[PDB]
């Protein structure tokens, strides 16, 4: 999960999401929660996604 | 009649209560209450090793 | 009555704060046990006492949001490279801010920070800011809810301290300014509701090494407002 | 989010500092302080030498004996010590002070071979010379023993007691024929005798129920509550010379007993699972008097080996200002008497290495370089070659190199083709590099010297593999 | 590598960019300062832009583009503008 600060054009990383990110946005009204979709295509048979959000504080995931 | 309500400050100023039924408790009687003393703060997101 | 007398402390008292409206005192020292007392003139007791290992805290404070006033986040920091936020809810949930987005090479410590509101000034998303000190001339303004690096500001010469001055603009609008010093004692006075760029700079009449600057009189960190119009 | 993945006999062989001190004659046997064996004594000729657990040399000794001395034995309190000589005037004198002699009392005129105190009583001392009678002298009135413990056919030679059972004294003569007298008896008969065959070398009691005797090229056990043997062992070149027992020490074996048998190796059996050795370690010849320290040596623990030549091998295991301190005083409180305790630590893990972080940051080239250096381990090199073959593309790992970088790869496959577990995989390594790098060797004709050297040694090794396969084919035919 | 933009009056820093990974040696611009192009010994020439109304109101610069078309180093750049060439 890579987030760019625009006015430095640089990035904060999140290394091992154990899958493939499909869609992501922030959705807190003050902007504290990142909703996203993992997919983890280690089986090509099914489009078996994985819904999770994570906090903006330490980027810990709540309710995979 | 046959009900006793006791009151005690759990934190520094909040009053908690207890409704002891009165006639069948022993003569001396202690009431244990749940109280945070050295409880390990456990998150809703981490295991033992964090 | 001696406010430590109910449940005493062991180390020094490096930080001491009040809740902005509720009758609550916070005590924080190097023995890494931030206590909170309910204080009154007769016999004052300990509401809770959070302890956190491996982080001897240096400064810690209360914070409430200006908008909906129901947040009550403690912020605490010591000599280490992480600080902690806490939503107090009478078993605690605390978060550990350590994600330095832009600048990662300027903090040997988090041991000096302030907290301050600001407005958005195109919308009115009034929200918090942590203001951390750095090492060369760096003071970084983060977010308080999320943790995002909002921006940073470097002054020329070594930071010694800094403070925050708000000022009203209209009935419902306000503007925040950060005041920062050197040891030499020439201050920068720059607003940070727009981007952090210097709008005033002058010089103290004297001082070889100045140590501590504090603004007051109106509202500030120690006397915060509750409604936005009350600033 | 998550982290990143990472890819008994050892106790008795972590015994070291095995130093040597040669005496001037042989070492009869030794002793140990029973309350705290932090010192120990060996029975040199015409002197007894006493050593500590720290300096590992003589801390005290006594050498005004006039003849060769045989037996050194502490009392169970560990204050004084007995010593029997060839003259037959057995001397008891205080330990931790050699220059005083408490009382030297004569036994029979035969050489007093063994002399040991009572195991629990502090005032009665058992002696045995070659008078075919042993004696329970009393040191309060050392003018005549209480018991003239007679009833031997020939040469009473090794004494012991039973530990928890006081009145049973187990003596052993050169007749087999291990006697065990009652001290309230007439001193002429045992209640029964244990039928060893050889002359017994010495006997100890490892239980209050089970003793072990040794004599001749096998040692025996003996039950005392039913007069029974359950065990012998005889895997020694000469007779098992001395025995020793220890209970409740720090090992994957709860209690041990050793037998030393004049053939270099000393064997460490166990009454946990009926007397099997973990491994026996040799010495420099005929091992006569060998024992480790007892239980309460407290960590530092010494095995000593006084050979029949006389050299003692000792192998030991051994496990700003006030204002600034008041500024940083609260560092050890750690949350004892207050409400909740957080714990959010990241752990400083094992030392990640340069090749490992090269794999972590895809630094494949210097990962190969850190693999092929003599400072790193050979099996580390094998494992990183296997793991990077399993991980990444060898083509993009070798996408720009030349033979001056390729040469330690070939120089180590030179010795790694002979491996059992990495032979074909390092063959696959050289297969890929020669599969895509023929232009380099046809430009620079250097490294085909190592290619042809490789070819002749791999013809040798394929002959070796062929003949090994047909020898197990012989096993298959003679199934 | 730290291309730092300081303000002239008040003598203060304005922005910073640690995008260069080596020693910067040279940098130029155009007439009304819509851009600044820098280069040094990372053999990379890259851009910063101040063109839009938001950039000229807030006085802000963005690390717009980056470009490596060199072999070893840069030790000099310069730039020219006209109505016949740019």
UniProtKB/Swiss-Prot annotation, chain B:
Coiled coil: none annotated. It is found in: Nucleus, Nucleolus. Involved in nucleolar processing of pre-18S ribosomal RNA. Required for optimal pre-ribosomal RNA transcription by RNA polymerase I together with a subset of U3 proteins required for transcription (t-UTPs). Present with 33100 molecules/cell in log phase SD medium. Interacts with snoRNA U3. Interacts with MPP10. Component of the ribosomal small subunit (SSU) processome composed of at least 40 protein subunits and snoRNA U3. In the absence of snoRNA3, forms a complex with other t-UTPs. This complex can associate with pre-18S ribosomal RNAs. Belongs to the UTP5 family. This is U3 small nucleolar RNA-associated protein 5. It comes from Saccharomyces cerevisiae (strain ATCC 204508 / S288c) (Baker's yeast). The gene is UTP5. The chain holds residues 298 to 347 of 643 of the full protein.
Swiss-Prot record, chain C:
The gene is UTP18. It is found in: Nucleus, Nucleolus. Present with 9570 molecules/cell in log phase SD medium. This is U3 small nucleolar RNA-associated protein 18. Interacts with snoRNA U3. Interacts with MPP10, UTP21 and UTP25. Component of the ribosomal small subunit (SSU) processome composed of at least 40 protein subunits and snoRNA U3. Coiled coil: none annotated. Involved in nucleolar processing of pre-18S ribosomal RNA and ribosome assembly. The lineage of its organism: Eukaryota, Fungi, Dikarya, Ascomycota, Saccharomycotina. WD repeats lie at residues 8-47, 52-90. It comes from Saccharomyces cerevisiae (strain ATCC 204508 / S288c). Belongs to the WD repeat UTP18 family.
UniProtKB/Swiss-Prot annotation, chain D:
The keyword Ligase does not apply. WD repeats lie at residues 22-63, 64-103, 109-147, 151-191, 195-232, 235-279. One of its GO terms (biological process) is maturation of SSU-rRNA. The keyword Acetylation does not apply. GO terms for molecular function: U3 snoRNA binding. It is found in: Nucleus, Nucleolus. GO terms for cellular component: 90S preribosome; nucleolus; nucleoplasm; rDNA heterochromatin; small-subunit processome; t-UTP complex. Keywords: Nucleus, Repeat, Ribonucleoprotein, Ribosome biogenesis, rRNA processing, Transcription, WD repeat. Involved in nucleolar processing of pre-18S ribosomal RNA. Required for optimal pre-ribosomal RNA transcription by RNA polymerase I together with a subset of U3 proteins required for transcription (t-UTPs). Interacts with snoRNA U3. Interacts with MPP10. Component of the ribosomal small subunit (SSU) processome composed of at least 40 protein subunits and snoRNA U3. In the absence of snoRNA3, forms a complex with other t-UTPs. This complex can associate with pre-18S ribosomal RNAs. Present with 358 molecules/cell in log phase SD medium. This is U3 small nucleolar RNA-associated protein 15. The gene is UTP15.
UniProtKB/Swiss-Prot annotation, chain E:
Involved in nucleolar processing of pre-18S ribosomal RNA. Required for optimal pre-ribosomal RNA transcription by RNA polymerase I together with a subset of U3 proteins required for transcription (t-UTPs). Coiled coil: none annotated. Present with 5440 molecules/cell in log phase SD medium. Interacts with snoRNA U3. Interacts with MPP10. Component of the ribosomal small subunit (SSU) processome composed of at least 40 protein subunits and snoRNA U3. In the absence of snoRNA3, forms a complex with other t-UTPs. This complex can associate with pre-18S ribosomal RNAs. This is U3 small nucleolar RNA-associated protein 4. It is found in: Nucleus, Nucleolus. WD repeats lie at residues 12-49.
């Amino acid at each position: 999960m890579s987030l760019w600060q625009l006015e430095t054009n640089s990035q904060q990383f999140l290394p091992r999401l154990n899958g493939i990110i499909i869609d992501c946005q922030v959705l807190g009204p003050q902007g504290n929660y990142y909703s996203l979709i993992l997919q983890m295509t280690e089986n090509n048979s099914n489009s078996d996604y994985q819904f999770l959000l994570l906090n903006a504080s330490d980027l810990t995931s709540k309710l995979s | 009649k046959d009900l006793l309500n006791v009151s005690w400050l759990q934190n520094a100023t909040m009053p908690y209560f207890k409704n002891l039924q009165w006639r069948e408790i022993p003569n001396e009687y202690t009431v244990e209450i749940s109280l945070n003393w050295n409880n390990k703060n456990k998150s809703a997101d981490r295991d033992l090793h964090g | 009555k001696d406010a430590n007398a109910s449940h005493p402390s062991h180390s020094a008292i490096q930080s001491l704060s009040f809740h902005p409206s509720k009758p609550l005192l916070l005590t924080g020292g190097y023995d890494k046990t931030l206590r909170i007392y309910h204080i009154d003139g007769k016999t004052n007791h300990l509401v809770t006492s959070l302890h956190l290992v491996g982080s001897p805290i240096q400064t810690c404070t209360f914070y409430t949001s200006l908008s909906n006033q129901n947040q009550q986040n403690i912020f605490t920091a010591g000599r280490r490279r992480y600080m902690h936020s806490w939503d107090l809810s009478l078993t605690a949930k605390i978060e550990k801010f350590s994600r330095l987005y832009g600048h990662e090479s300027t903090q040997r410590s988090f041991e000096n920070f302030k907290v301050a509101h600001l407005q958005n000034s195109q919308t009115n998303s009034v929200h918090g800011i942590v203001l951390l000190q750095g090492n060369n001339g760096w003071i970084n303004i983060l977010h308080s809810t999320s943790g995002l690096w909002l921006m940073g500001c470097k002054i020329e010469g070594v930071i010694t301290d800094f403070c925050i001055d708000y000022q009203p603009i209209s009935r419902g609008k306000f503007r925040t300014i950060l005041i920062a010093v050197n040891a030499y004692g020439e201050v920068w006075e720059f607003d940070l509701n727009k981007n952090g760029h210097v709008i005033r700079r002058w010089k103290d009449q004297g001082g070889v090494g100045i140590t501590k600057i504090q603004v007051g009189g109106g509202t500030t960190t120690t006397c915060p407002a509750l409604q936005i119009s009350k600033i | 989010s998550t982290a990143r993945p990472r890819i008994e006999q050892r106790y008795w062989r972590q015994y070291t500092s095995a130093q040597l001190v040669k005496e001037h004659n042989s070492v009869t046997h030794i002793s140990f302080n029973p309350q705290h064996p932090h010192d120990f004594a060996v029975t040199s000729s015409t002197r007894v030498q006493i050593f500590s657990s720290r300096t590992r040399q003589v801390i005290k000794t006594f050498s005004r004996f006039k003849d060769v001395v045989y037996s050194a034995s502490f009392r169970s309190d560990g204050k004084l010590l007995c010593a029997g000589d060839a003259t037959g005037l057995v001397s008891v004198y205080d330990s931790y002070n050699p220059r005083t002699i408490l009382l030297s009392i004569n036994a029979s005129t035969h050489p007093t071979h063994v002399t040991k105190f009572h195991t629990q009583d502090n005032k009665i001392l058992a002696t045995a010379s070659d008078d075919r009678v042993t004696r329970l002298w009393d040191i309060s009135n050392a003018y005549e023993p209480q018991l003239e413990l007679t009833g031997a056919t020939d040469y009473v030679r090794t004494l012991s007691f039973i530990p928890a059972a006081p009145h049973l004294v187990a003596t052993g003569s050169y007749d087999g024929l291990i006697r065990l007298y009652d001290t309230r008896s007439s001193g002429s008969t045992p209640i029964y005798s244990l039928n060893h065959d050889q002359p017994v070398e010495n006997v100890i009691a490892v239980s209050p129920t089970q003793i072990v005797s040794c004599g001749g090229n096998n040692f025996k056990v003996w039950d005392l509550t039913s007069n029974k043997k359950l065990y012998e062992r005889g895997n020694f070149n000469k007779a098992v010379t001395c025995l020793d027992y220890v209970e409740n020490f720090d090992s994957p074996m709860q209690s041990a007993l050793i037998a030393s048998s004049l053939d270099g190796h000393v064997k460490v059996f166990d009454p946990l699972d009926n007397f099997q050795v973990k491994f026996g370690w040799k010495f420099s010849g005929p091992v006569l008097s060998c024992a480790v320290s007892p239980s309460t040596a407290q960590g530092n623990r010494h095995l000593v080996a006084g050979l029949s030549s006389g050299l003692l091998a000792i192998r030991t295991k051994k496990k700003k200002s006030n204002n600034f301190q008041r500024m940083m005083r609260g560092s050890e409180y750690q949350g004892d008497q207050e409400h909740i305790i957080h714990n959010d630590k990241v752990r400083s893990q094992r030392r990640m290495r340069a090749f490992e972080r090269n794999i972590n940051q895809f630094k494949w080239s210097e990962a190969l370089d850190n693999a092929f250096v003599p400072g790193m381990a050979k099996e580390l090199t094998l494992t990183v070659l296997q793991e990077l073959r399993k991980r990444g593309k060898v083509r993009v790992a070798l996408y720009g190199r030349d033979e001056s970088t390729l040469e330690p790869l070939l120089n180590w496959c030179l010795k790694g083709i002979e491996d059992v577990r990495s032979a074909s995989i390092v063959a696959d390594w050289v297969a890929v590099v020669l599969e895509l790098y023929g232009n380099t060797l046809e430009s620079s004709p250097v490294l085909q010297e190592l290619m042809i050297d490789l070819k002749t040694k791999v013809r040798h090794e394929i002959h070796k593999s062929k003949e090994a396969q047909r020898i197990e084919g012989m096993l298959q035919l003679l199934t | 590598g730290s291309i730092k933009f300081w303000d002239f009056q008040f003598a203060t820093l304005n922005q910073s960019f640690k995008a260069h990974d080596a020693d910067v040696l040279c940098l130029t611009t155009d007439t009304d300062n819509n851009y600044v192009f820098s280069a040094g010994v990372d053999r990379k020439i890259f851009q910063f832009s101040q063109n839009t109304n938001k950039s000229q109101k807030n006085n802000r610069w963005v690390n717009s583009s980056n470009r490596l078309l060199h072999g070893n180093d840069i030790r000099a750049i310069c730039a020219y503008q006209s109505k016949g060439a740019d």
